[PDB]
Design a protein around this ligand. Sequence first.
Ligand SMILES: Cc1cc2nc3c(=O)[nH]c(=O)nc-3n(C[C@H](O)[C@H](O)[C@H](O)COP(=O)(O)OP(=O)(O)OC[C@H]3O[C@@H](n4cnc5c(N)ncnc54)[C@H](O)[C@@H]3O)c2cc1C
Ligand SMILES: Cc1cc2nc3c(=O)[nH]c(=O)nc-3n(C[C@H](O)[C@H](O)[C@H](O)COP(=O)(O)OP(=O)(O)OC[C@H]3O[C@@H](n4cnc5c(N)ncnc54)[C@H](O)[C@@H]3O)c2cc1C
Ligand SMILES: C[n+]1nn(-c2ccc(-c3nc(CCc4ccccc4)cs3)c(OCCC3CCNCC3)c2)cc1CCCCN
Ligand SMILES: C[n+]1nn(-c2ccc(-c3nc(CCc4ccccc4)cs3)c(OCCC3CCNCC3)c2)cc1CCCCN
Lengths: 489, 489
Amino acid sequence: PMSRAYDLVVLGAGSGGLEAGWNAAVTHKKKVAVVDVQATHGPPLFAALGGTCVNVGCVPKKLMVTGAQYMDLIRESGGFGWEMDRESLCPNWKTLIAAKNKVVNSINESYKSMFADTEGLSFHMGFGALQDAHTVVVRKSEDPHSDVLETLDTEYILIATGSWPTRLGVPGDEFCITSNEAFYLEDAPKRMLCVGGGYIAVEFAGIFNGYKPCGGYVDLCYRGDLILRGFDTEVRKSLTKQLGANGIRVRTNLNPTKITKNEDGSNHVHFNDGTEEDYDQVMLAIGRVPRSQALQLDKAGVRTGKNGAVQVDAYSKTSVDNIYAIGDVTNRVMLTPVAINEGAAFVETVFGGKPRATDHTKVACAVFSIPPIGTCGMTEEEAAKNYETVAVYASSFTPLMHNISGSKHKEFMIRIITNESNGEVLGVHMLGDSAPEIIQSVGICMKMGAKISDFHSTIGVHPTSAEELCSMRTPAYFYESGKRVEKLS
Amino acid sequence: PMSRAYDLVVLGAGSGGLEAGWNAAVTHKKKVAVVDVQATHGPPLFAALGGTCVNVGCVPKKLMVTGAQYMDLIRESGGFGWEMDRESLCPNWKTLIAAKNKVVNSINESYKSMFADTEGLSFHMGFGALQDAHTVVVRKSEDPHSDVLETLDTEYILIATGSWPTRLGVPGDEFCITSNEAFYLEDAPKRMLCVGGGYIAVEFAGIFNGYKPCGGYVDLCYRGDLILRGFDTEVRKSLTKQLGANGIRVRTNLNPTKITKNEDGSNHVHFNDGTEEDYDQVMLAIGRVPRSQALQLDKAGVRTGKNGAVQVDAYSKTSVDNIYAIGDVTNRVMLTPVAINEGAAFVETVFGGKPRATDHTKVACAVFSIPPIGTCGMTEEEAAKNYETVAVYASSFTPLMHNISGSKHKEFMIRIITNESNGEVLGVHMLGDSAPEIIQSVGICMKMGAKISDFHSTIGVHPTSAEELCSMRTPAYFYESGKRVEKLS
Ligand SMILES: Cc1cc2nc3c(=O)[nH]c(=O)nc-3n(C[C@H](O)[C@H](O)[C@H](O)COP(=O)(O)OP(=O)(O)OC[C@H]3O[C@@H](n4cnc5c(N)ncnc54)[C@H](O)[C@@H]3O)c2cc1C
Ligand SMILES: Cc1cc2nc3c(=O)[nH]c(=O)nc-3n(C[C@H](O)[C@H](O)[C@H](O)COP(=O)(O)OP(=O)(O)OC[C@H]3O[C@@H](n4cnc5c(N)ncnc54)[C@H](O)[C@@H]3O)c2cc1C
Ligand SMILES: C[n+]1nn(-c2ccc(-c3nc(CCc4ccccc4)cs3)c(OCCC3CCNCC3)c2)cc1CCCCN
Ligand SMILES: C[n+]1nn(-c2ccc(-c3nc(CCc4ccccc4)cs3)c(OCCC3CCNCC3)c2)cc1CCCCN
């Protein structure tokens, strides 16, 4: 019974939005309108058709991490007897950026193919904004007195506008770059300062390190004690050391007070401890907050709260019953396959009839550091609060192939966290090469409620780094009533 | 009640033997004697303390596969903008062999540390042989009229002498090398012929290819149709193509009739189709048979059969109740972590009191080809015989990073085999980089009896090759009553 122009309007053609949009349009034959600000990546808006992940997140970030490993792998080759010229070896950053752009640009092109070819699914380039719970407006600019391009009469609204990097707010904030501007840099920087301790800081530390032009260096500088908060505490310490030996100088309890410009265009940076220093480029990876701040949410009566977060029930529904919100705008788990799920399960809830919420517990996570981390489930810290008796299994070995390659800093590390009672696996925490591949399969096991029994009853694959999961039988130590004990009562 | 000199005599200090030996000695305080032919690796006996795996199998083989990838990874680097000299690039094979020997030799040294330091555990260098069910003899040579070094009065005997490469038996057999002689080659061969279609042929094809000195080439030559029998049929076809594009010429329905020597020391090789050709070195990887053929088994009354195989019940026990046999000598699954388990469960059976057999079904396997294979559980061929209704899920994608690297032949491939009835996962079959790491975790899931439900209910790790396990929902096709059908009745 056609009353409105569109069944669904989606603010943001991101990981969350596109999954919701596409499903609604092809599997339930709804008429869908998807709003985004631009159709291909790049400044000054960065995000585009495909979302943060495709244009300025996971996909480019990984392409450039893969680049920066070639440094560590061309060093490693010498031991296996690859003689070749190690004077004529610095990486050309322009060839990396050009290649990365060709790729992201191909994905943006393959999405316009999707819209023109898919029926009932339209793309509306501009700036989303609510008037009431059934009308979405598209402007030229986010300035609310801009020319209005379209008025989208609709039944349901899905807010999936994602998040945006937080600024430092000090004298000199406007001289620093972000995850956004890092991707379209013209030159790889000789002297680089990565402020922050989050996964993005550490991934980008490894890139700029890999692509430093000759006599260059990278300083990571984090305002706390130990990088990567709410990761396993021995994995963080082991990475902090391994970044050290790949060339990255890590500093802690350290915060920029001030950045002035310089003569040759470098950045003078004043710190906590008094210290000043010059860096070519300075990058802020200090958390990412929701983009609610220009959607005129207050106008159509949807609940805001912690940093603009769209306040939502388990089934992704806002304080207005026809308006829903998914992905980073909601501020739950800020990963791409989470948003995809939340959006897939929004379509099943609303249009599909088959109502479902998203599972947020024991989701497998990965850091594309050098070396990388895989993690799934809980730290031993938050285990020993929520569980009576906790076993901690732990194992750290160095692949023999590193006794050849020279890379003897590269410790591979596994930790398993247990409920003593029934032996259930609560957490798994890996560091070292191939950890992101291995954890994906572990994430399946912990969904089926795997016990430590099930790991060490499994015949191994020899020789592998993963075969050390099934050789962990004795707990290293325990927690009873959340206090660390040598051995169990 | 001490009646005999030793509780346990172990023929062969291999993967199986050492696990049995060590456990018996430290966890059950038995007096153990371990017999092997030499203490460090190398010709003319090759195997030594640590077994085939440590000296001339898995461990060296992987070190040298890791070497040969540096070829494909230095090519790949150029696209990510690693300018460097690609004239001055051939691999030095002597630096690889020297480095490999330093490693294997360190492991042999770390095992003599284990014997001198561990109590009740002695090492007896020579050639094992039964006199009766309670006496083992050690000779200088395998020639049964050799000088006798020791007479080991014992209660239990464990036969774990492993296996040995099969010869071709044609005019010219004694000119060809094997897995054994390949490891101690002086020069990497310009023109290499790998006869065979088994995992060892294909791993070693990739090595000799990686380390060919300049204008050199490798021919794989298999007497059948499609290499790697009893692997998934689309994975075999995909590898056959990818070996092709890494440089390896594969020939099929082809068997050497004759090898004569040559003038400059190369090998003239006559084939089925008439064809002759000269190769520097020619390697036989055409199956590996048990080493029973010199243990005087018939003398002490233990059951032989299929190619010398020691005929054994589920708990590893021979036709004589005090004699047991594990690992490749038994001719079950010829992998190292299998033998380790069979030996660990021999010690639990006999000395431990807690009797247990080894689980052989759904053991995860891996080929260190370039690119590598991970496999666990059954082919779709042997599924559709033993199961009424079978679903086959299948997915083949190319990581975007190969649109940069130039390696566009590198297809990553997953196949899942299902029981239609209950959705149980019977088999998993992967090809492409990191497949051996991923399958280890899958092997755990299929031990817990994982359904296809459990895979695609799991939030992904983005971006990963493994995340394509959890995005497989629609079966590609089915088998009902073991006949391939487009769609299900
Ligand atoms: C450097 C980096 C690396 C990352 N790496 C990973 C990783 O490895 N794995 C992982 O799982 N996640 C990763 N993430 C996170 C991932 O990118 C996000 O979690 C994911 O994109 C969230 O999906 P979404 O749809 O909620 O947001 P988005 O994909 O950001 O969707 C928001 C879209 O809406 C548009 N938009 C914003 N405001 C408006 C408006 N007013 N009108 C119209 N359109 C608008 C934006 O332009 C954008 O296209 C990374 C993020 C970054 C920054
Ligand atoms: C090239 C190659 C690659 C391989 N790769 C892998 C792999 O990646 N993964 C995997 O799981 N498996 C692999 N294998 C198989 C693995 O090496 C064997 O399955 C494993 O070693 C079997 O253990 P075992 O104890 O039965 O035999 P072994 O380890 O061979 O033990 C036999 C030992 O007994 C000794 N011996 C023999 N006769 C006598 C005698 N009369 N008296 C005394 N001692 C004697 C031998 O010298 C040897 O030390 C590979 C094999 C080869 C050849
Ligand atoms: C006509 N037509 N075009 N397309 C169509 C066309 C395209 C895509 C994609 N392209 C990329 C770019 C990846 C890349 C490939 C090669 C090189 C670089 C990048 C991602 S996804 C697509 O997405 C289906 C899954 C979805 C998509 C939305 N997210 C959810 C999943 C559907 C499909 C149809 C048939 C539909 C009939 C209409 N009723
Ligand atoms: C005194 N002492 N020495 N050792 C002792 C000493 C050594 C080893 C090994 N060394 C390697 C070499 C690997 C390498 C390391 C570094 C560089 C290259 C190679 C493998 S394993 C060892 O194996 C314990 C598990 C077993 C072993 C048998 N297979 C089964 C598992 C026990 C141990 C003790 C205490 C025992 C007290 C005696 N009652």
